[PDB]
Design a binder for this molecule. Structure first.
Ligand code: DGD
Ligand code: DGD
Ligand code: CLA
Ligand code: CLA
Ligand code: CLA
Ligand code: CLA
Ligand code: CLA
Ligand code: HEC
Ligand code: BCR
Ligand code: BCR
Ligand code: BCR
Ligand code: OEX
Ligand code: CL
Ligand code: CL
Ligand code: FE2
Lengths: 30, 334, 56, 37, 27, 442, 244, 97, 137
C-alpha cells in the first residue's frame, strides 16, 4: 500500500508538470 | 523546399514551445533513457552488490524501501571502472545483480546535462541574447560530474560514486568525510560560503526590491498586480533601496548600479560552487583536507587535543565501520 | 507538550514581527510613495534622516 | 644540492621560483599608478 | 638571509613604476 | 571600450603589442621551468626517492635518460643543472623581446611588414601561421624520437633488472598498433591512450605525430579553408582563442589521467606508485607475510566467502582480493613476473617471490598517493609524522583544476565570439528586440 | 605453443579449464611401487541446479535450472594433492591445496537468489579396486567439506556476527528477544558434499586427463538464519598427473 | 540451544592461555622465542591431544624443544572449533591494530 | 610537565646500565625516526606487519632483547626476526642493507643511538598511544 502511495504521488507531480507547462496562463505583454 | 533544410529549420526554430536545437537532438533521447531507467529501477530493481562482496543492497520500493531510503545502487566494485552495458551481461538478471542500471543512467544523464548546458548557449544565440547563462549552469554541472564520474575515476570504481538516492547521498557524504576530511578542506569551505552567501544575497536582494516597490495597488490586491509583464518602467525604486541599505551598513557597501549588483549575484554562488566541485574533483586524487591531528603537544611531548582531534575521533568511527565486510588488509587505500 | 509549545512560541515570534511591521508601516503596506524624491534617501540633504525640516 | 662553485647562490635560488607571481602583482601596482584606466 | 634577496628582487618591479612616474613617462 | 579589468582585450587588433605579450609570457614559462628545476636541485638529496622530496621536474628530466642509471638511481646531477640554467638563461632573451615588442616596438605590425602582420579575418594568413606552428610541433615530437634512438635512449621501468636507460632501436610503426590506441575504450582494462605501456610504442607514436604535424603544416601553408569550413566557424581572434582553450582543456584532462594511471612514461620509481599500484602492493605485502607464516593463500576463504588473498575477476583472471579487486587491471614491473596466462599464478606465488619484490611492495604500500593539503602523508585519520604527498596527487589535482577552468574559458570566449560576430554582445537593441517580432508561444 | 596473459585477459578463457583433443583415448598406467601427485586439478561448472520445495508429502521436489548472476568467477583450479595406491589397487586422490572454492550465486525462477560456496575443500575421491591404468572409463567418487559461506568475522546489516559484532537487535532495545534468537545467534555450518569425476579422455603420453563431474552440496544458510537449499553442479574437469 | 560458540570458547582455557588448536598465530608473540618460527610449526601441526604433543613435532632442535618446555604452562588444548580455524583465520583473523 | 632527565634516562644494555640522553639527542632521534623509519613505523606501530610494534614491552620480549640502546643499535645494523632465528637485512632497512635502503647510507653511529633513544623515550611520554594504533589517536 505504501509503494502504491509513493508512486501515485510521484505520478501526480508528473501530470502537474504537463499542465503547468502546456496549460499555463500565457504571459501577455503590456 | 529542401528536406534537410526544412528539418534544420524545425530543429532550430524559435517557435517551438520547447526549444529543440542541435544540442537538444542529443539531450532528448539521452535524458529520456536515463529518466525511464531511473524510474523503473527506483520502483522495481532487485538488490545490487555494490561493493563486490556478494552482499547485495536493496534500493527499490518493491523490495522494502521508502522514498527516503530508496536508491538506484552503484555498480559492483568487481566491475571497477569497466564499461558494463546491457549487452556485456549474459542476461538482464546478471546485469541487475551487478548494478548495470546505475551506469546506464549516469552516462545518459551526464551526456544529456552537458547538452542541456549547450542548449542554453544555443537558444541564447537564436534569441540575440548574451551568452553566459550556460556558464552559470556549469557550476551545478561540474558538481554532478565530480560525484558521478571524477571521484569514481580517481578511486577506481563506480561503486564509490554517489548513489542515486536520498539516504545513499548521505552515505556518500559520511564516507567522504572519513576518507578525505572534506570539512577541513578549503574548497568545501568556499562551497559553503558560496551556498550560504547565495541564500543570504537571494534573501537580501528579494527583500530590498520587495521593500521599495512603488505603490500601484490597494490593500485589497496583491502588490504583484502592480507590475505588468513587459512594461518599460522599473517597478521598484533602486535609489530608495540603495538609500536604505547604504544606511543599514554604510553607503559605499551598497550597490546603486543594478548591473554590478546582479553580476555580483551571479558570480558569488557560481564561483563558490566551482570551488566545491573542484574540491570533490581533487579529493578524487586524495589531496585531502588539512590534517592537524596531534599538531599541539606540550613541553614534555603530551598530545594536547584540539577540536581537530575531536573531528578525527568521529572520522575514525566512520572509517572503521563503513563497508564493514569489505576490507581484509589494514589500510583503506581507496 | 514541551516540543509543541516551544515550536509554537518560535512561530508566534514571526507573527509578532509580521503584525508589528504591519502596524508601524501601515502607510506603505501597498508600496512606497511614487513621489518619494531622491533628496530624502541620498546622503547629506537632511541633517536628520527623513526629517525634511533639517534641510541644509 | 647545486654544484659546489654555485653554492654561494643557494638562498637566491630558494626565491627564484616565486618571481613569476611577482609579475602578476606588478601589474596591479602599475594599474594603481595610473588609476585603473 | 633569503629575506635579503627576496627583498632586493621584490623592490625591483615597484621601483620601475616609481622611476617612470616621477620622470613622467609612458605608463 | 574595455575596462581595466578586461584590459588585454585592448590588444586584439594591436598585433605588435600582442606579439610582445605572447613572448614576454613565453619567457615566464621558461623562467619558471628553469628557476624551478634549480630549486628542486638545490633541495634534491639523492639518498631519498624523488617522490619523498616534492619533485615534479627532475622526474621529467630523469624519465628522458639524463642523470640516472639502473633502477632509477641518480648517478649524475649535472644534466639537471644544465636544463635549469639553460631554461633560466633563455627566459631573459624572451623577456627582452617580449618587453621590447610590448613597450617600444611598433604596436601594429602590418604597416611595417606584410609577412609578420595579420588580420584575424584573413583565413589564408591564419592557416599559414597555424601551418608554421604545426611544423615546429612536428619537429619537437621528432626531437623526442632522436633522444630515444640516437642520443642515449629513455628510462625504461620495464627493462629487465629493475629498470634502466635503454636505446630504442625498433620503434613501433605498425599503424594498427599506433592508431589502435586511439580507438581503445577509455573505460577500465582499456584506458584509451593512457594504457601505452612500452617505449617502442611511445617512440613510434611520435614518429607518426611528427610526420602528421609536418604534413599538416605544409598542407595549411599551401591551402585556404574550404567553403564548408568557412561556413562552420567564426573567424575572429576571440573565436580562435576559444578553440584553443577547448583544446587545452581536453589535453589537461588527459594529462590528469595519464599521471594518475600510467607508470611507463611516469615511472613509479620517480613519481611514486599509482593509486592502483599502492593498493595492489598492500595485498601483495600481506599475502607474502601470511604465506611466510604458513597460510595457504589460495585456499583461504575471507569473511564474504570470496578469497581473502585471491579471487577471480569478472572474466576469470586470478587477481588480488579485498577492495583492490577493483584495481586488477593494474600492471607493473614488480608484479608481472607472477602473472601466468590465467592471471596470478599460485605456483609462482608460492615459490618465486623475490626479496626485491617484497621490498618494492612494502615501499609502494607505504607511499600510496594519499595525503593532506598540508602534506601529512597517509589516510585522513593518520597522525602527523610523515611529510609526504605523492607527486601524482599534486600533478593530477593541479591539472584537473586548470583543465576545468580552461573549459569555462572556452565557453566564455566561444559564446562571446558568437555573440560579438552577430552583433549583440553588448546587449539587446531596444528598437529591434528579436523576441518582440516573434509570435508568442501560446 | 600456448597463450600469454595478454591474449587471455578480458576474454573469459581464464575461467575455462584446459581441454584435451578428442583423439586422447589412451591409458595412463599406474605402478604401485611409484607415488603420484595431481599437479593441477581444474573444475569448470556449466550447470547449477537447485532442488525446489514441494510443500507436500509424497512428491519429493525436482532439481530445477537457474541463472548465474556472478559472471565468469566460478572455476576451481590449481588444485594439487596426493594420488595414492591402496592395497587393493584403488586410487585415492587427497586434496592438499588449491583455489578450491568460489562463491557463486544463481537465481531461481521467481527471483530468489541462491548463494553457495562451490568447493571441493578436503576432497578425498577414490576409484574402484584394481585400476593399474587410468582410462576413458575410470570414475573417481568422493566427498568433501562445505564450510559456512561466510566466515566468522562476517557482520550482517545490523552489525551482528559470530566472532565479531553485536549479540542482539540493538535497534529494538525492549523487544522480546526470543523471537529474534535465530537471527541474533550466528552459527557456523560445516556440511559434506559428494562428487563423481568421470574420466572421458586420456593423454597417455603427458599424463593429462579430462572429463565430467557432478557434485551435490548445500547452499548458504546465512549463518543459521534460514534453511539451505540442495544443489547439484555439473561441469568438466582437467587434471595433470605427475610421478611424485 | 542457539549458542554463540566463540563466546562459549572464552569460557574455557582458550580464554586464558594460548590454545594450540584454535588460537590465532599472533598470540605466540606474548612469550619469548616462539614467533615466528615455532609459532609457524605449532599452527601447521595442529591439532594436539595434549599440550606435550608439541614436543614430538619432527625437526625440533633441542633449543626449540627447550623453549617449548619453558612455555608449556602458557599453553592449553581444547577441541578444534571450526569457526576459529576455517578461513585461514589462525594466520590472519582480520584483527590488526 | 616537561622533558626531565628522568624521562630521558633509558637502559643502555641488558645489564641495567642506564644512559641519560639530552633533549638535543631526543629531538635528533625523533627527526631521524621520521626520516628513515616512520613511513612504516609512525606512532610506534608497523604498517607492513601490525603484529609487531615498538612498545617497550614488545621489544623486551624480542630475542636478542631490544628494550635497550645496544639491542636497537644492533637491530639497525643486523635486524633479525622476533625470535632471532633469521637475519632480515634484505627486507628491513639496516646499515648492512644500505645498498638497497639508501636512506641508511648517511647514518652515523651517533644517529643510531639517537633513534634508539627516541624509540625508548616516546612510550614514557605518550603511554598507550605509542604502538597502540588508531584506537588511541
Ligand atoms: C570533443 C568532445 C569530446 C567527446 C568525447 C565523448 C566520449 C568520451 C567521454 C569521456 C568518458 C571518459 C570516462 C573515463 C573513464 C575512465 O576509466 O577514465 C580513465 C581512463 C584511464 O583508464 C584507465 O587506464 C588504465 C591504463 O593503465 C594500464 O596501463 C598502464 C601503462 O603504464 C599501467 O601499466 C596501469 O597499471 C595499467 O592498468 C587501466 O586501463 C584502467 O583500468 C583504466 O581505468 O582515462 C582515459 O581514457 C583518459 C580519458 C580522459 C577523459 C576523462 C576526463 C573526463 C573529464 C570530464 C570533464 C568534466 C568537466 C565538467 C564540465 C562542466
Ligand atoms: C567568505 C568566507 C570564505 C572563507 C573560506 C576561506 C578558505 C579558508 C582558507 C584559509 C584556512 C587556512 C587556515 C590556516 C591554516 C594554516 O596555517 O595551515 C598551516 C599549514 C601547514 O600546516 C602544518 O603542517 C604540518 C605538516 O606536518 C607534516 O610535515 C611536517 C614538516 O612540514 C612534519 O614532518 C610533520 O610530522 C608532518 O606530519 C603540521 O601539521 C603542523 O602542525 C601544521 O601547522 O599550511 C599549509 O599546508 C600551507 C599550504 C596550504 C595553504 C593553502 C591555503 C589554501 C587557500 C586556498 C584558498 C582558495 C584560494 C583561491 C585563490 C583564487
Ligand atoms: C590562453 C588563455 C587565455 C587568454 C589569452 C585570455 C584572454 C582574455 N580573456 Mg579569458 N579566460 C581564460 C583564459 C584566457 N583568457 C580562462 C581560462 C577563463 C576562465 C577562468 C577566462 C575567463 C575570462 C572572463 C570571465 C573574461 C575574460 C576576458 C578576457 C580578455 C581580457 C582579460 C584580462 O584583461 O584579464 C585581466 C586580468 C585580471 C583581471 C587578473 C585576474 C586574476 C585572476 C582571476 C586570479 C589569479 C590568481 C592566482 C590563481 C593565484 C594568485 C596568488 C596570489 C599571491 C596573488 C582577454 C582577451 C574578458 C573578456 O570577455 O574580454 C573580451 C572577461 O570578461 N576571460
Ligand atoms: C602575463 C601577463 C601580462 C602581459 C604580458 C601583459 C602585457 C600587456 N598588457 Mg596587460 N594586464 C595583465 C597582464 C599582462 N599584460 C593583468 C594581470 C592585468 C590586470 C591588472 C592587465 C591589464 C592591462 C590593461 C588595463 C592594459 C594592458 C595593456 C598591456 C600592453 C601594454 C602595457 C603598457 O603599455 O605598459 C606600460 C607599463 C609600463 C611602461 C611600466 C613597466 C612595465 C614593464 C614591462 C615591466 C617589466 C619588468 C621586467 C622585470 C623587465 C625585464 C627586462 C629584461 C628582460 C631586459 C602589454 C602588451 C595595455 C594595452 O592593451 O594597451 C592598449 C592596457 O591598457 N594590460
Ligand atoms: C602548476 C603546477 C604545479 C604543481 C603540481 C606544483 C606542485 C608542488 N610544488 Mg610547485 N610551484 C608552482 C606550480 C606547481 N607546483 C609554481 C607556479 C610555483 C611558483 C610560485 C611553484 C613554486 C614552488 C615552491 C617554491 C615550492 C613548490 C613545492 C611544491 C610541492 C608542494 C606543494 C604544496 O605544498 O603546496 C601547498 C598548497 C598550496 C599553496 C595551495 C595553492 C592553492 C591555490 C593558490 C588555489 C588555486 C586557484 C586557481 C589556480 C609540490 C610537489 C614545494 C616543494 O616541496 O619543493 C621541492 C616548494 O617549496 N613549488
Ligand atoms: C615568435 C616570436 C617573435 C616574432 C614573431 C617576432 C617578430 C618580429 N620581430 Mg622580434 N624578437 C623576438 C621574438 C619575436 N619577434 C625575440 C625573442 C627577441 C629577442 C631576441 C626579439 C627582438 C627583436 C628586436 C630587437 C627587433 C625585432 C623585430 C621584429 C620584426 C622583424 C624581425 C626580422 O627582420 O627578422 C630577423 C630575422 C632573423 C634574425 C633570422 C634568424 C632566425 C632566428 C633569430 C633564429 C631561430 C630561433 C629559433 C627558431 C628558436 C630559439 C632557439 C631556442 C629554442 C634554443 C618582426 C615583426 C624588429 C622590429 O620590430 O623593428 C621594428 C626589431 O628591431 N625583434
Ligand atoms: C593544431 C591542429 C590543427 C588545427 C587547429 C587545424 C585546423 C583546421 N584544419 Mg587541419 N590538420 C592538422 C592540424 C590542424 N588543423 C594536421 C596535423 C593535418 C594533417 C593530417 C591536418 C589536415 C587537414 C585537412 C586535410 C583539412 C584540414 C582542415 C582544417 C580546417 C577545418 C577543421 C575542422 O573543421 O575540423 C573539425 C573536425 C571535423 C569537422 C570532423 C572530424 C572530427 C573528429 C575526427 C572526431 C573525433 C572526436 C573525439 C572525441 C576525439 C578523440 C580522438 C578521436 C580520434 C577518437 C581548420 C582551419 C580542412 C580545410 O579547410 O583545409 C583547407 C581540411 O579539409 N586540416
Ligand atoms: C617498512 C618499509 C619498514 C621500515 C621503513 C622500517 N621498518 Fe622496522 N620493521 C618493519 C617490519 C615489517 C618489521 C617486522 C620484522 C619482522 O620480524 O618480521 C619491523 C621490525 C622492526 C623492529 C623490531 C620490532 C619488535 O617488536 O621486535 C624494530 C626495532 C624496527 N623495525 C626499527 C626500525 C627503525 C629504527 C627504522 C628506521 C631506520 C625502521 N624500522 C624502518 C618494517 C619497517
Ligand atoms: C633571475 C634573476 C634576476 C631577475 C630578477 C627579476 C626578473 C625580477 C623581477 C622582479 C619583479 C617582477 C618584481 C615585482 C614586484 C612586485 C611587487 C612587489 C608587487 C606588489 C604589489 C602589491 C603589494 C599590491 C598592492 C595592491 C595594489 C597595488 C592595488 C590593489 C590592492 C593591493 C593591496 C593588492 C636577477 C636580476 C635578480 C639576477 C639574478 C637572477
Ligand atoms: C609587458 C608587461 C608586463 C609583463 C612583463 C613580462 C612578463 C616580462 C618578462 C620578463 C622576464 C621573463 C624576464 C627574465 C629575466 C631573466 C633574467 C635576467 C635572468 C638572469 C639569469 C641569470 C643572471 C643567471 C644566473 C645564474 C647562473 C648563470 C648559474 C646558476 C645561478 C644563477 C641563477 C645565479 C606586465 C604584466 C608586468 C605589465 C604590463 C606590461
Ligand atoms: C604520440 C603517441 C601516440 C600517438 C598518438 C596519435 C597518433 C594521436 C592522434 C590523435 C588525433 C588524431 C587527434 C584527434 C583529434 C580530433 C578532435 C579533437 C576533433 C575535434 C572536433 C571538433 C571540435 C568538431 C567540432 C564541430 C562540429 C562537431 C560540428 C561543426 C562545428 C565544429 C567544427 C565546431 C601513442 C598513443 C600511440 C603512444 C604515445 C605517444
Ligand atoms: O568502497 Mn566505497 O569506500 Ca572508497 O575506501 Mn576503500 O573504498 Mn570502499 O572502502 Mn573506504
Ligand atoms: Cl558504508
Ligand atoms: Cl582490503
Ligand atoms: Fe533583481
Amino acid at each position: 500500500m505504501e509503494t502504491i502511495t509513493y508512486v501515485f504521488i510521484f505520478a501526480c507531480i508528473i501530470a502537474l508538470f504537463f499542465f503547468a507547462i502546456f496549460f499555463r496562463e500565457p504571459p501577455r505583454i503590456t | 523546399a529542401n528536406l534537410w533544410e526544412r528539418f534544420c529549420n524545425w530543429v532550430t526554430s524559435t517557435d517551438n514551445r520547447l526549444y529543440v536545437g542541435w544540442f537538444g537532438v542529443i539531450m532528448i533521447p539521452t535524458l529520456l533513457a536515463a529518466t525511464i531507467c531511473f524510474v523503473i529501477a527506483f520502483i522495481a530493481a532487485p538488490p545490487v552488490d555494490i561493493d563486490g562482496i556478494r552482499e547485495p543492497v536493496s534500493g527499490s520500493l518493491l523490495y522494502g524501501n521508502n522514498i527516503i531510503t530508496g536508491a538506484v545502487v552503484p555498480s559492483s566494485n568487481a566491475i571497477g571502472l569497466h564499461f558494463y552495458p546491457i549487452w556485456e551481461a549474459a542476461s538482464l538478471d546478471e546485469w541487475l545483480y551487478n548494478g548495470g542500471p546505475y551506469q546506464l543512467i549516469i552516462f545518459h544523464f551526464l551526456l544529456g546535462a552537458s547538452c542541456y548546458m549547450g542548449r542554453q548557449w544555443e537558444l541564447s544565440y537564436r534569441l540575440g541574447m548574451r551568452p553566459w547563462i550556460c556558464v552559470a549552469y556549469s557550476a551545478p554541472l561540474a558538481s554532478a560530474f565530480a560525484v558521478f564520474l571524477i571521484y569514481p575515476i580517481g578511486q577506481g570504481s563506480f561503486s564509490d560514486g554517489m548513489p542515486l538516492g536520498i539516504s545513499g547521498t548521505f552515505n556518500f557524504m559520511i564516507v567522504f568525510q572519513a576518507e578525505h576530511n572534506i570539512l577541513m578542506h578549503p574548497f568545501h569551505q568556499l562551497g559553503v560560503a558560496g551556498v550560504f552567501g547565495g541564500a543570504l544575497f537571494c534573501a537580501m536582494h528579494g527583500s530590498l526590491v520587495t521593500s521599495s516597490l512603488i505603490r500601484e495597488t490597494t490593500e485589497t490586491e496583491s502588490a504583484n498586480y502592480g507590475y505588468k509583464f513587459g512594461q518599460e518602467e522599473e517597478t521598484y525604486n533602486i535609489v530608495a533601496a540603495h538609500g536604505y541599505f547604504g544606511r543599514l551598513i554604510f553607503q559605499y557597501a551598497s550597490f546603486n548600479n543594478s548591473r554590478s549588483l546582479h553580476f555580483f549575484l551571479a558570480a558569488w554562488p557560481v564561483v563558490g560552487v566551482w570551488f566545491t566541485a573542484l574540491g570533490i574533483s581533487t579529493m578524487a586524487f586524495n589531496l585531502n583536507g588539512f590534517n592537524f591531528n596531534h599538531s599541539v603537544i606540550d613541553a614534555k611531548g603530551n598530545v594536547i587535543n584540539t577540536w581537530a582531534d575531536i573531528i578525527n575521533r568521529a572520522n575514525l568511527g566512520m572509517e572503521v565501520m563503513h563497508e564493514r565486510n569489505a576490507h581484509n588488509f589494514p589500510l583503506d587505500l581507496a | 507538550f514541551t516540543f509543541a509549545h516551544a515550536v509554537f512560541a518560535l512561530l508566534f515570534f514571526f507573527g509578532h514581527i509580521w503584525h508589528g511591521a504591519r502596524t508601524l508601516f501601515r502607510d506603505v503596506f501597498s508600496g512606497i510613495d511614487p513621489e518619494l524624491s531622491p533628496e530624502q534617501v541620498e546622503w547629506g540633504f537632511y541633517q536628520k534622516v527623513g526629517d525634511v525640516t533639517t534641510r541644509r | 644540492k647545486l654544484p659546489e662553485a654555485y653554492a654561494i647562490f643557494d638562498p637566491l635560488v630558494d626565491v627564484l621560483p616565486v618571481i613569476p607571481v611577482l609579475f602578476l602583482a606588478l601589474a596591479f601596482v602599475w594599474q594603481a599608478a595610473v588609476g585603473f584606466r | 638571509a633569503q629575506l635579503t634577496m627576496i627583498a632586493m628582487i621584490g623592490i625591483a618591479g615597484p621601483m620601475i613604476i616609481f622611476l617612470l612616474a616621477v620622470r613622467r613617462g609612458n605608463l | 571600450g574595455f575596462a581595466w579589468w578586461a584590459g588585454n582585450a585592448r590588444l586584439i587588433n594591436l598585433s605588435g603589442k600582442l606579439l610582445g605579450a605572447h613572448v614576454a609570457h613565453a619567457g615566464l614559462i621558461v623562467f619558471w621551468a628553469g628557476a624551478m628545476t634549480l630549486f628542486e636541485l638545490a633541495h634534491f638529496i639523492p639518498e631519498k626517492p624523488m617522490y619523498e622530496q616534492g619533485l615534479i621536474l627532475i622526474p621529467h628530466i630523469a624519465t628522458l635518460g639524463w642523470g640516472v642509471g639502473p633502477g632509477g638511481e641518480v648517478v649524475d646531477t649535472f644534466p639537471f643543472f644544465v636544463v635549469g640554467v639553460v631554461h633560466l638563461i633563455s627566459s631573459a632573451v624572451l623577456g627582452f623581446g617580449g618587453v621590447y615588442h610590448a613597450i617600444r616596438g611598433p604596436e601594429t605590425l602590418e604597416e611595417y611588414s606584410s609577412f609578420f602582420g595579420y588580420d584575424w579575418k584573413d583565413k589564408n594568413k591564419m592557416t599559414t601561421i597555424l601551418g608554421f606552428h604545426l611544423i615546429v610541433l612536428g619537429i619537437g615530437a621528432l626531437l623526442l624520437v632522436a633522444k630515444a634512438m640516437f642520443f642515449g635512449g629513455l628510462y625504461d621501468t620495464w627493462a629487465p633488472g629493475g629498470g634502466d636507460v635503454r636505446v630504442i632501436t625498433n620503434p613501433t610503426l605498425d599503424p594498427r598498433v599506433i592508431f589502435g590506441y586511439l580507438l581503445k575504450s577509455p573505460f577500465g582494462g582499456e584506458g584509451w591512450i593512457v594504457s601505452v605501456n612500452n617505449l617502442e610504442d611511445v617512440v613510434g607514436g611520435h614518429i607518426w605525430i611528427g610526420l602528421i604535424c609536418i604534413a599538416g603544416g605544409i598542407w595549411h601553408i599551401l591551402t585556404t579553408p574550404f567553403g564548408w569550413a568557412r561556413r562552420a566557424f567564426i573567424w575572429s581572434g576571440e573565436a580562435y582563442l576559444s578553440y584553443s582553450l577547448g583544446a587545452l582543456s581536453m589535453m589537461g584532462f588527459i594529462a590528469t589521467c595519464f599521471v594518475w594511471f600510467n607508470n611507463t612514461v611516469y615511472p613509479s620509481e620517480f613519481y611514486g606508485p599509482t593509486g592502483p599500484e599502492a593498493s595492489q602492493a598492500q595485498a601483495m605485502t600481506f599475502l607474502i607475510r601470511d604465506q611466510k607464516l604458513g597460510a595457504n593463500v589460495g585456499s583461504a576463504q575471507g569473511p564474504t566467502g570470496l578469497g581473502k588473498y585471491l579471487m577471480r575477476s569478472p572474466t576469470g583472471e586470478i587477481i588480488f582480493g579485498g577492495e583492490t579487486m577493483r584495481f586488477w587491471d593494474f600492471r607493473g614491473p614488480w608484479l608481472e613476473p607472477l602473472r601466468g596466462p590465467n592471471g596470478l599464478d599460485l605456483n609462482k606465488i608460492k615459490n618465486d617471490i623475490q626479496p626485491w619484490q617484497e621490498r618494492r611492495a612494502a615501499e609502494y604500500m607505504t607511499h600510496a598517493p594519499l595525503g593532506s593539503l598540508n602534506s601529512v602523508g597517509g589516510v585522513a585519520t593518520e597522525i602527523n609524522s610523515v611529510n609526504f604527498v605523492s607527486p601524482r596527487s599534486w600533478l593530477a589535482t593541479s591539472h584537473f583544476v586548470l583543465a576545468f577552468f580552461f573549459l569555462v574559458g572556452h565557453l566564455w570566449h566561444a559564446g562571446r565570439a558568437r555573440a560579438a560576430a552577430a552583433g549583440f554582445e553588448k546587449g539587446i537593441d531596444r528598437e529591434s528586440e528579436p523576441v518582440l517580432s516573434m509570435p508568442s508561444l501560446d | 605453443q600456448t597463450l600469454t596473459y595478454d591474449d587471455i585477459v578480458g576474454t573469459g578463457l581464464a575461467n575455462k579449464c584446459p581441454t584435451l583433443d578428442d583423439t586422447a583415448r589412451g591409458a595412463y598406467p599406474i605402478d604401485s611401487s611409484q607415488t603420484y601427485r595431481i599437479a593441477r586439478l581444474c573444475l569448470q561448472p556449466t550447470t547449477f541446479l537447485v532442488k525446489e520445495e514441494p510443500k507436500n508429502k509424497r512428491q519429493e521436489a525436482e532439481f530445477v535450472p537457474t541463472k548465474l548472476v556472478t559472471r565468469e568467477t566460478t572455476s576451481l583450479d590449481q588444485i594439487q594433492g596426493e594420488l595414492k595406491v591402496n592395497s587393493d589397487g584403488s586410487l585415492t586422490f587427497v586434496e592438499e591445496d588449491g583455489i578450491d572454492f568460489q562463491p557463486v550465486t544463481v537465481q531461481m525462477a521467481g527471483g530468489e537468489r541462491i548463494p553457495l560456496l562451490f568447493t571441493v575443500k578436503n576432497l578425498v575421491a577414490s576409484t574402484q579396486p584394481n585400476v593399474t591404468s587410468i582410462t576413458t572409463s575410470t570414475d573417481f567418487k568422493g566427498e568433501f567439506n562445505v564450510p559456512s559461506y561466510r566466515t566468522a568475522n562476517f557482520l550482517d546489516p545490523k552489525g551482528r556476527g559470530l566472532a565479531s559484532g553485536y549479540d542482539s537487535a540493538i535497534a529494538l532495545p525492549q523487544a522480546k528477544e526470543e523471537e529474534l534468537a535465530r537471527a541474533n545467534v550466528k552459527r557456523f555450518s560445516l556440511t559434506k558434499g559428494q562428487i563423481s569425476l568421470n574420466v572421458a579422455k586420456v593423454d597417455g603420453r603427458t599424463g593429462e586427463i579430462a572429463g565430467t563431474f557432478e557434485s551435490e552440496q548445500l547452499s548458504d544458510d546465512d549463518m543459521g538464519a534460514h534453511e539451505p537449499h540442495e544443489v547439484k553442479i555439473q561441469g568438466v574437469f582437467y587434471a595433470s598427473i605427475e610421478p611424485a | 540451544e542457539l549458542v554463540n560458540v566463540v563466546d562459549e570458547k572464552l569460557g574455557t582455557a582458550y580464554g586464558e592461555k594460548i590454545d594450540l588448536n584454535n588460537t590465532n598465530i599472533a598470540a605466540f608473540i606474548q612469550y619469548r622465542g616462539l614467533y615466528p618460527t615455532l609459532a609457524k610449526l605449532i599452527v601447521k601441526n595442529a591439532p594436539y591431544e595434549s599440550v606435550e604433543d608439541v614436543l614430538n613435532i619432527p625437526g625440533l632442535t633441542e633449543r626449540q624443544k627447550q623453549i617449548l618446555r619453558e612455555n608449556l604452562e602458557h599453553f592449553t588444548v581444547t577441541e578444534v572449533e571450526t569457526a576459529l580455524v576455517e578461513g585461514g583465520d589462525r594466520y590472519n583473523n582480520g584483527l590488526y591494530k | 610537565a616537561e622533558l626531565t632527565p628522568e624521562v630521558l634516562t633509558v637502559p643502555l644494555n641488558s645489564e641495567g646500565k642506564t644512559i641519560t640522553l639530552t633533549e638535543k639527542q631526543y629531538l635528533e632521534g625523533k627527526r631521524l625516526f621520521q626520516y628513515a623509519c616512520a613511513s612504516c613505523h609512525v606512532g610506534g606501530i608497523t604498517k607492513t606487519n601490525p603484529s609487531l610494534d615498538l612498545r617497550t614491552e614488545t621489544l623486551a620480549l624480542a630475542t636478542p632483547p631490544r628494550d635497550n640502546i645496544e639491542g636497537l643499535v644492533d637491530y639497525m645494523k643486523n635486524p633479525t626476526t622476533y625470535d632471532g632465528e633469521q637475519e632480515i637485512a634484505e627486507v628491513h632497512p639496516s646499515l648492512r642493507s644500505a645498498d638497497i635502503f639508501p636512506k641508511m647510507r648517511n647514518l652515523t653511529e651517533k644517529d643510531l643511538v639517537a633513534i634508539a633513544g627516541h624509540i625508548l623515550v616516546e612510550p614514557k611520554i605518550l603511554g598507550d598511544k605509542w604502538g597502540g594504533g588508531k584506537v588511541y589517536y
